[PDB]
Amino acid sequence: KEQMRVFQKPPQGSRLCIVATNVAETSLTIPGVRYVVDSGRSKERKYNESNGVQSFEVGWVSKASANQRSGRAGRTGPGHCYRLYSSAVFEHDFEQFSKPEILRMPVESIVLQMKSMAIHNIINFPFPTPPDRVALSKAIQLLQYLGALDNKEMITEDGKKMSLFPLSPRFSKMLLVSDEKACLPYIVAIVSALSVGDPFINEFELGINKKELRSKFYKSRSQFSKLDKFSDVFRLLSVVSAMDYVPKEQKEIFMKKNFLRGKLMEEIVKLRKQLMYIIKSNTSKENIAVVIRNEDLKSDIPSVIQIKLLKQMICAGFVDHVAVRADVLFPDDAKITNRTSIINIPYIPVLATRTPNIEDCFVYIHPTSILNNLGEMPPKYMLYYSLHLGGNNKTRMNTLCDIASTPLANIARKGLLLTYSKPLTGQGLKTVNLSPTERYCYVVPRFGSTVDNDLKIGWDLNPIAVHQKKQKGQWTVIKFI
């Protein structure tokens, strides 16, 4: 009804003023407009390739968009366009043409909405602007790991909820499965910190790698290191959770003391409020009536059981991005001892192609990680955000947390990255069978590549009790016993 009023002609003695978004530029025609004021800023979906974050940001429009804004004032008669930027910024910062949205997307997202429409053929589908065939094939594979697509490439129940989230599938995965044991306030805080960026100023940036100052840096890091010895993700949870109780007058003092970035943390505060609403809208039953309060954001320190579960939800998003220590898979392939520093301990990704020399596949810990100041041996299985070639010596690791054996299996159970062996028989390994399609038995799960598949590098997890039901001749697992 309101856009009926704008299209309704003005009263006599009154000049018309309309104020709107790009929709007024192109979507519709405004009769009688002789003056157009151009801010030059529009909010459009943006995908960040380096950190894989999808967001909606206010930024400069393309040169074509600005011209369409200026031609608006000249439909009925000669008019004037007043741009709130200069020619120089128009020449340099305004791109000639707006990029297609398909190029401003996660590739996993495009297939997700594409599959949410129940369209089978993604690889051969005639895009106006096709993404690379290789880019697509990875995207389908990533969603299958996220459980959004089943074995037959069809969207699953996780998938339909996955499409409803406007975020990237990786982050939307953790938010969906996190509605257990009141762990939602913690998980979004990670998502907010990860989505916006790292708020920790490291020693190298500080140039202190003065002897009193480096200690204060160490004390500040140690103060945020109580949640978990082996995890860097929860240290990010410490600052964001500790941020909220820092009153308004104590922001800057808190920030100078802790060597953190002010403008970054305030943003994270805003993302949490926005992020919760998206989750509580889809998850809750009164999707649109829900409203966020700062009190819901506020929460106390996680319990040890809650910490373990949080490690599970984080790994749920990053099942593919999980690394193993090399000695466990290949003993003596790389010499290791207690003398070797932690930063020099090799690790292997699960989907790393096996090269003739296994040393090439190795990845190593970043010095800034909490795992550096640790001393004793690091854990066998690591979860990481991504890999960075930075550092000429070795590839470095953006670690999140440490995941144990059985938790990793139950998380990969939904995904296709985990395979199960045949029923184990032997000492105390009788296979219980209730019906011809039903049985309860021990199985050693295999995570990663199949034993036949030598191209990729899979490994075997610890044996675990499990319930299986036979479906289409396949002994599908139901739950670990």
Partner: peptide, 4 residues
């Protein structure tokens, strides 16, 4: 606080 516990976090601090």
């Amino acid at each position: 606080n516990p976090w601090l």
